[PDB]
Write a protein that binds this ligand. Structure first.
Ligand SMILES: CCCCCCCCCCCCCCCC(=O)O
Ligand SMILES: CCCCCCCCCCCCCCCC(=O)O
Ligand SMILES: *C(=O)CCCCCCCCCCCCC
Ligand SMILES: *C(=O)CCCCCCCCCCCCC
Lengths: 269, 55, 238, 256, 238, 269, 55, 125
């Protein structure tokens, strides 16, 4: 809950709740009651919706690709990163270190494709989404033995059903996920610089278990991330400049705010 | 082995978990704990409002 | 075979739902926690922290540290206006990019008091008094110090305590206000005037600067979560 | 020695007597009072003028004719120019009040007629021209009664209120206005109507220029009549008294 | 994997169902309540309130305040009929648009007693007696005061108590009645007659008016919810 | 329950339960027992179905639009208002202030469209309904980043399944929803007049996540509103005149009731 | 944490809620509370039926 | 950590700070208050606006020159046009008030001068 205001009356003392020295690096704690006559008000207002869990715990699309029924793009692959999407990336980046569990929901959608193919009569498409942790063998074709997933986890989902969803633990090696990294990967202060030295979550492959029809079909897998059971440390300034890369802080300089005219103009221009 | 907790108001909602892993559980939406005197006031020597900051 | 019956909402994916999902990694042992300094527990712990306000948006100063400086000078008269911006913490170009304004842009409603800590950055030999005032909406913005008068003010005497906190109360018809603008949900005006012109000795600079800081009070709260309009995207970054 | 017909209401400097009346109809069963710390939002301390604001303000008299359709007075705006009620209302962003509305109309034993004295909370009115909204100068009349129309107002390219009495300017049935606190001034048994309105609104306090929370309407359901000789000029005088007026948010004066 | 089995009704959307749905806005803090005057808890609290009845529908008086006035005049005889309308609170053009008739049009059945409060709006010098009567169905409407006689009546003497309440009891074969018309569910007739002609002195008007009010009694209840036929639409309003 | 009638006998007193003065603004409380000889009857009749919850708590269609597989109308948008439908609007308007929770059910239905397109073999269509609270970025195309809903709530629903449904809190700033507003938005008694000064619920966008086929398909989203946990204050006359606008009281004058002939006519004409 | 309440008749029906928000709950169909003497009889001085209204 | 030099006076909407001062000189040892039933004559009930009237009204600034002789401001008439103090004062036959007069003048360490700030009861000129 939020703090209620205390009924205040006049004052004429040497107590100065309003005068301070902001150089101390300490935020003042003045409240209306200190610089005016306040009435008692009872605050039932709650800061429930601004807890870190409520802020971050909402499914956001982090990426999406396509694969097909035929041709070259018959299976897809994505090296896992939350940095390809501007929206979720920016919320996580309000904090230097974050620790959390994840809830993965996938929205797989197919579209019939233009063809000269006559007598199309598609059968129901079943998809396989497979996770290849850093080090395991990678599918080099829609049919390499790799898709057996004897040990790799993978979801088989038939179209028309509810979106495939599963949760994942805090898969880090560190006691918290690092959102920023002011360092290199090599001790010779060389090689990679930044957060990419840390990103090693593996790849995610998807494919059609069956082609289904004689005509072409293209599917689009959308990956949704939802941070459950979140812990966030060391907050920082929200991102001002637009994102340029998915692996680095690279920004193009932009001004502090938008403008108006005179410091006296009560209106944005 | 259920747990009856309170709903968000201005009642109760019973809950049981079915999964063996804590990661499979629902989010923790009801933690309204807070401590701004890490950021507001991280000063070594205490600063009292009614007193002159620099004396 | 227990007789069940589905209700509307089955097999639907609500972005903000809160359900249990099977773990894809069973009996996985999570790397033990570590106490890392400065943990955030609520976003209001961040909005309660002073952040420098770019009052002098004006022109290209927004592309500089000048956006942050409020020019104060030794006049030939008092009652002059130093600055003026409306009470719109999430909307006004002044507050919109503050620590408070960025957090407020992720929410639809807001309610509470705000502290505007002004710090005098002149020479140790400069003096001066300023009338820091907040006038609720209803009749336009005060155009004279004599109109700012009648409002909620605080006369600031520059001295050893560099800074002075003008605290803006919550004077609203409604419990909350829209973060975005709406004249129903109008906020008011914050103005500053010379009370007694800036007096400086000989050999000390007569034109100084003031800095403004914005933080939320213990009664501040934000409601109804939405996306900030501040972060766009054309393609997935690579 | 008593009588259900006699009355005397004292508020501030003013006192009001009645020698023929009905009960005092108290709002929605609620008698006006001040705002509680539990229901308050505005943190600044209020001005409660008391005897200076909460007193009997007698606006202009209006003439009841054999052909008058009705009249209406918005509420904060009526007393917006009267005394210290109008002053505090200008210097303050927020305000809250209740009222004791005393409508007076005396005729004789040979006169007949019957008025409906209602208090319509939030009388949002319609425009003659369906595309527009009535103008502020068409809806409001400070202390000067605004009057209903006998027949439909023409829908040109105006911002005229659609005044036909039978729809009350709100698109409803004028005969159902009886849900809103009211009384009747049947000249046969009555002499005046007294209605004590509590503060009705969805917010604890609101601005007094931008929003008129209650609208008083005096609509004659059975017309004035009398045989020749019987005095022809029968006026109606409206006396309203604010009750438990508080004002938050002081600043310079006006509205803009 | 608990063995379940669906029953007919699965994935069906019943307009009047009563189920739990996931909140789209979690841990959302609702603006605290406020005690606002005159809360309604049941629709019958509204149907128990008198509303003026447009007895004189007749012609273009329906487009006027005249629909509301019941003409009473000084005759050269008594036994004459003042008015007459059937007991159909939701159907008759008289009652259909009343506070009682509008609420009744949202329901299919109704049961109870009704109060018809008549108020005399003549001069303070006019006198008169009226026979207010309700005759159940079975044999037509009374065409003479001598037929209205035998019914359930109340002789009204005009005096200091302006108004007189003719209360219509529930005399029905069935427990409820249809709000819409049905002769099985027939209601009866309400008529008014001069008992003793209107006597006025010299210089006082001889033609007055009466007003009728309709409210429900403590035994009134409506059943089976449906849509009113009174509100139409051709396109979504804009 | 309803009140039972008391057995009454004859009377000959100066007690007058039937004579009153309706000028008082007080409804008479006469009952059959007062103006006749009554029998005792036991009333078991209940006023259960006329409680405000039962009256208002039934799903009503408040609006509906269309979007397509291809072309210009590829996504839809609706600024939320219960005033576009005559039916639900009129029930809510029996009260000046109403306060309640909402239950949203959407009935999304698609129709194949006429084309010269040969070999059509549609894939299952999945739809996304997104809410943009007042202030958030708005989708300017079926594919703007906006549809990531990292923080905005949104429903993904595949065709053939049960209707997507979710409930919403009392989203107002005021301690009750205002159904009417006799005021302006500007302190200068200018600008907007009426309830629209108050309506600021945001917009609702819908789109096809996938096109599905080579041929054209047009969908129609129907939004249903159901007031749960209702509180209503200050009742008023039901709407007589027909509705003309969705933002204002604007009516075209109509007569008090329908007509019949003489005040003596026992029959509607 | 269930709640057994009565059904509408002329029995019981057990109920448990699964959601953390009170807004996610079912409607309140069984509140037959009522008070017409806000509208019928909002007069300051009491009016007794058997007595003359105006005396 | 205190100082005889610091001060803060809160009256209504307004607050006043000082970083260099002397004591507050209280009238004739009397702090303002309301009229007692013992000392009252006017039988009608008073309006005591409170926060609306009793607050800090900052009149116009004046320039201190090397040749300025002095200045004077009558008291009820000064605030006679200011806010709700001036309003109540016009609608009412009788009135009674006390004041907290704060005269402000800041110069530097290289400036010199000395003003007499008096409150003359009944300065018949
Ligand atoms: C079918 C199984 C799918 C499993 C999905 C595994 C996804 C891993 C998610 C890692 C989360 C966010 C981490 C950013 C990493 C870093 O920069 O250190
Ligand atoms: C996918 C999330 C959808 C969320 C649906 C939100 C709809 C908001 C409903 C507001 C309700 C009725 C309010 C009328 C508003 C007014 O006039 O004040
Ligand atoms: C503690 O839970 C004892 C009460 C059990 C209530 C019945 C449980 C309902 C179904 C649960 C099975 C768990 C699913 C893996
Ligand atoms: C109180 O509820 C203890 C008894 C529990 C009975 C079994 C509950 C049936 C399934 C409930 C799980 C809740 C869904 C979130």
């Amino acid at each position: 809950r939020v703090a209620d205001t205390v009924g205040t009356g006049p004052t004429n003392s040497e107590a100065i709740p309003a005068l301070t020295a902001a150089e101390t690096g300490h935020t003042s704690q003045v409240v209306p009651s200190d610089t005016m006559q306040t009435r008692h008000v009872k605050n039932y207002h709650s800061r429930s919706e601004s807890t870190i869990e409520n802020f971050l715990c909402r499914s956001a699309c982090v990426y999406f690709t396509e694969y097909e029924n035929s041709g070259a793009k018959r299976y897809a692959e994505w090296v896992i990163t939350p940095r390809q999407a501007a929206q979720l990336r920016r919320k996580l980046e309000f904090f230097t270190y974050v620790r959390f569990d994840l809830e993965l929901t996938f929205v797989i959608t197919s579209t019939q494709q233009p063809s000269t193919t006559q007598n199309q009569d598609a059968q129901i498409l079943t998809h396989q989404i497979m996770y290849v942790p850093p080090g395991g063998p990678v599918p080099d074709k829609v049919d390499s033995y790799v898709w057996q997933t004897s040990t790799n986890p993978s979801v088989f989902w038939t179209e028309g059903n509810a979106p495939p969803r599963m949760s994942v633990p805090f898969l880090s090696i560190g006691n918290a996920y690092s959102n920023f990294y002011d360092g290199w990967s090599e001790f010779s202060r060389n090689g990679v610089y930044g957060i990419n030295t840390l990103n090693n979550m593996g790849t995610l492959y998807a494919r059609h278990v069956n082609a289904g029809s004689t005509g072409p079909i293209k599917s689009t897998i959308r990956i949704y991330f939802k941070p459950k059971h979140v812990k966030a440390w060391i907050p920082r300034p929200p991102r001002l400049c637009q994102y340029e890369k998915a692996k680095n802080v690279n920004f193009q300089p932009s001004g502090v705010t938008t403008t108006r005219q005179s410091i006296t103009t009560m209106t944005n221009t | 082995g259920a747990q009856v907790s309170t709903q968000k108001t201005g009642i109760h909602y019973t809950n049981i978990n079915y999964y063996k892993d804590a990661a499979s559980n629902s989010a923790n939406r009801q933690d309204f704990t807070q401590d701004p005197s890490k950021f507001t006031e991280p000063v070594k020597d205490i600063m009292i409002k009614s007193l002159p900051a620099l004396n | 075979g227990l007789p069940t019956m589905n209700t509307p909402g089955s097999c639907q994916f609500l972005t903000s739902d809160d359900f249990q999902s099977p773990s894809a990694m069973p009996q996985y042992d999570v790397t033990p926690e570590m106490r890392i300094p400065g943990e955030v527990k609520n976003l209001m712990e961040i909005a309660e922290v002073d952040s420098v306000v770019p009052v002098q948006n004006v022109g290209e100063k927004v592309n500089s540290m000048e956006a942050y400086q409020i020019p104060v000078r030794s006049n030939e008269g008092s009652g002059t206006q130093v600055f003026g911006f409306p009470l719109q913490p999430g909307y006004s170009s002044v507050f919109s990019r503050t620590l408070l304004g960025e957090i407020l842009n992720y929410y639809t409603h807001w309610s509470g008091s705000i502290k505007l800590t002004f710090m005098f950055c002149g020479s140790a030999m400069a003096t001066g008094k300023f009338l820091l005032a907040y006038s609720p909406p209803g009749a336009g913005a005060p155009t004279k110090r004599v109109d700012a008068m009648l409002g909620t003010h605080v006369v600031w005497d520059v001295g050893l305590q560099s800074s002075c906190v003008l605290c803006i109360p919550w004077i609203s018809q409604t419990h909350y206000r829209y973060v975005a603008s709406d004249e129903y949900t109008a906020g008011g005006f914050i103005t500053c005037w010379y009370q007694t012109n800036i007096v400086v000795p000989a050999d000390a600079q007569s034109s100084c600067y003031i800095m403004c800081f914005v933080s939320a009070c213990n009664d501040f709260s934000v409601r109804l979560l939405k996306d900030t309009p501040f972060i766009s995207q054309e393609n997935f970054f690579q | 020695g008593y009588s259900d017909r006699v009355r005397s209401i004292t508020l501030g400097n003013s006192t009001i007597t009645t020698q023929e009346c009905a009960n005092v109809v108290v709002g929605y069963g609620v008698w006006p009072d001040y705002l509680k710390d539990s229901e308050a939002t505005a943190e600044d301390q209020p001005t409660q003028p008391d005897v200076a604001t909460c007193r009997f303000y007698t606006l202009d008299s209006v003439q009841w004719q054999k052909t008058s359709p009705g009249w209406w007075w918005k509420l904060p705006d009526a007393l917006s120019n009267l005394g210290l009620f109008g002053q505090n209302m200008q210097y303050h962003y927020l305000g809250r009040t209740g009222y004791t509305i005393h409508v007076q109309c005396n005729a004789s034993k040979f006169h007949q007629g019957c008025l409906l004295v209602v208090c319509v909370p939030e009388a949002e009115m319609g425009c003659a021209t369906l595309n527009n909204t009535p103008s502020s100068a068409e809806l409001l009349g400070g202390d000067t009664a605004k009057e209903f129309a006998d027949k439909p107002v023409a829908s040109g390219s105006n911002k005229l209120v659609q005044r036909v009495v039978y729809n009350a300017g709100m698109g409803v049935g004028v005969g159902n206005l009886t849900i809103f606190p009211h009384q009747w001034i049947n000249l046969r048994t009555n002499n005046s109507a007294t209605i004590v309105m509590p503060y009705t609104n969805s917010v604890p306090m609101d601005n007094m220029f931008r929003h008129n929370n209650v609208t008083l309407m005096v609509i004659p359901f059975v017309p004035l009549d009398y045989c020749p000789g019987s005095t022809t000029y029968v006026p109606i005088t409206v006396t309203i008294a604010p009750m438990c007026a508080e004002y938050n948010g002081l600043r310079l004066a006006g509205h803009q």
